[PDB]
Design a binder for this molecule. Structure first.
Ligand SMILES: CC(C)[C@@H](NC(=O)[C@H](CS)NC(=O)CCC[C@H](N)C(=O)O)C(=O)O
Ligand SMILES: [Fe+3]
Length: 329
């Protein structure tokens, strides 16, 4: 038997305003959730998630195998040595059900000094033919900045929640250098569903993706209305209920590092469900050279002996480790 996680719905709209006491009341809710299961739903977020789901569906269901090879990351196409993060992540019929398209900061262009310097984790996005996917690139880039805006407000809530000034995290979250990514994940309905694409957990649960901590500061996730996520607690894994009107928010391991684990990165996994569905995360990453000094909210002096960790090194190591542990997505 599996229990259900407490995932409160938090009205985040005050974080866009100037009612400072109202913002503190949101911060308290974020604090409580971050100290409990680690997840909450952000509601009243102001993003048109219906259009997000529709546009994403039109892309996944119309892109052809030729287009997927042409956009494929290095793991599926040896010709694209520069595509470690951005591009298409192909399914393997009979073996791997999931497929996805990842893109990064639209400001990463050939003119960008990090591209010029060839710094790891920075890449220029790849896109399909505009005529074959009209409006898709424009929708996708607009969405990047829409969810960037929501995430910046959420970071103000996390900052206040930890007893800091509201820009403590957001000051490092900038359009000119953010390593944040969007991933448009398709989980297909398949009949028969290949056993090879289903993993079995230690506790016997059939999974599509094994346990992990998020590589992010925070994760801002939209999913269609199909329950699949589970969060680990001391009493075992608990089901996270689906809500296709809000965003599921949680801390990543960079937040756990800098708070001396006061806000843990919740361990989560994806149950196997034979249903057509969407999983559209926005990983709130900072700049490559962003460093946040660790602190410990449990101590009067707030002192932490943990080393300041550069976000770029954290991200590079984290993404490679996640592939090594849980497999190439
Ligand atoms: C919503 C999550 C559970 C989703 N999983 C995921 O997105 C998983 C675990 S957080 N994330 C990853 O594999 C890391 C993607 C990083 C991305 N290519 C980049 O370069 O930034 C899923 O549905 O599988
Ligand atoms: Fe995750």
């Amino acid at each position: 038997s599996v229990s259900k996680a407490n995932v409160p719905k938090i009205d985040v709209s005050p974080l866009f305003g100037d009612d400072q006491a109202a913002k503190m009341r949101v911060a308290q809710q974020i604090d409580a959730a971050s100290r409990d299961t680690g997840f909450f739903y952000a509601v009243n977020h102001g993003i048109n998630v219906q259009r997000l789901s529709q546009k994403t569906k039109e892309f996944h269901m119309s892109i052809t195998p030729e287009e997927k090879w042409d956009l494929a990351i290095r793991a599926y196409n040896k010709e694209h040595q520069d595509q470690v993060r951005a591009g298409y992540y192909l399914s393997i019929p009979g073996k791997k059900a999931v497929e996805s398209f990842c893109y990064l900061n639209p400001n990463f262009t050939p003119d960008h000094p990090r591209i010029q310097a060839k710094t790891p984790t920075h890449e220029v996005n790849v896109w399909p033919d505009e005529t074959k996917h009209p409006g898709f690139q424009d929708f996708a880039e607009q969405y990047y900045w829409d969810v960037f805006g929501l995430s910046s407000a959420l970071l103000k809530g996390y900052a206040l929640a930890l007893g800091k000034e509201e820009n403590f995290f957001a000051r490092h979250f900038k359009p000119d250098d953010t390593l944040a990514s969007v991933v448009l994940i398709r989980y297909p309905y398949l009949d028969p569903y290949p056993e090879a694409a289903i993993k079995t957990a230690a506790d016997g649960t059939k999974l599509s993706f094994e346990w992990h901590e998020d590589v992010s500061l925070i994760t801002v996730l939209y999913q269609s209305n199909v329950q699949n996520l589970q969060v680990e607690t001391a009493a075992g894994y608990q089901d996270i209920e689906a809500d296709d009107t809000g965003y599921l928010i949680n801390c990543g391991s960079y937040m756990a590092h800098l708070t001396n684990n006061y806000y843990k990165a919740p361990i989560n996994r994806v149950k196997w469900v034979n249903a057509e569905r969407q999983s559209l995360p926005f990983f709130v990453n900072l700049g490559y050279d962003s460093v946040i000094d660790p602190f410990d909210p449990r101590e009067p002096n707030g002192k932490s002996d943990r080393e300041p960790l550069s976000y770029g090194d954290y991200l590079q190591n984290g993404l490679v480790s996640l592939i090594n542990k849980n497999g190439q997505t």
